[PDB]
Amino acid sequence: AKVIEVELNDDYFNPNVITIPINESTTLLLKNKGKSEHTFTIKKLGIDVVVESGKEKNITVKPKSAGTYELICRYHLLKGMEGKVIVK
Ligand SMILES: [Cu+2]
């Protein structure tokens, strides 16, 4: 239903606020354009994906509950590598 590219950079997400539709499928193209390994982790949406430097992971999600969900990189959270996903 929706396709969204998300860049994983050293050390931030772009975009770092992502809005996706409730009860519909969204494909996320997770592209690591950084030199470091990064993750795209949203525990409350059941997502936890590692993306190596220069590589890509493509996932399709279908969230059932409206809300705002914290997105983190497990490796660089403390450096501010964080964002959110709004399901609406
Ligand atoms: Cu990271």
Buried/exposed code over 49-74 (b: 16+ C-beta within 10 A; e: otherwise): ebbeeeeebeeebebeeeeebebbbe
Ligand 1 centre distance from Cα of residue 2 (Å): 25
Structure tokens at 51: 């993306």
Q: β-pairing, 67-72 with 56-61?
A: unpaired
Ligand 1 centre distance from Cα of residue 15 (Å): 14
Beta-carbon count within 10 A of 23 CB: 11
Instruction: State whether residue 75 is helix, strand or coil.
Output: coil
Instruction: State whether residue 54 is helix, strand or coil.
Output: coil
Ligand 1 centre distance from Cα of residue 75 (Å): 5
Distance, in Å, from the CA atom of 72 to the CA atom of 30, rounded to the nearest integer, reads 13
Annotated binding site: 11, 38, 70, 73, 76, 84
Ligand 1 centre distance from Cα of residue 64 (Å): 27
Q: Sketch out the chain's domains with CATH numbers.
A: 1-88 (2.60.40.420)
CB 66 within 8 A of CB 87: yes
- Compute CA 39 distance to the chain's CA centroid, rounded to the nearest angstrom: 8
CB 86 within 8 A of CB 16: no
Given CA atoms 43, 16, 64, 66 in this order, what sign does their dihedral have? positive
Q: How many residues does the chain have?
A: 88
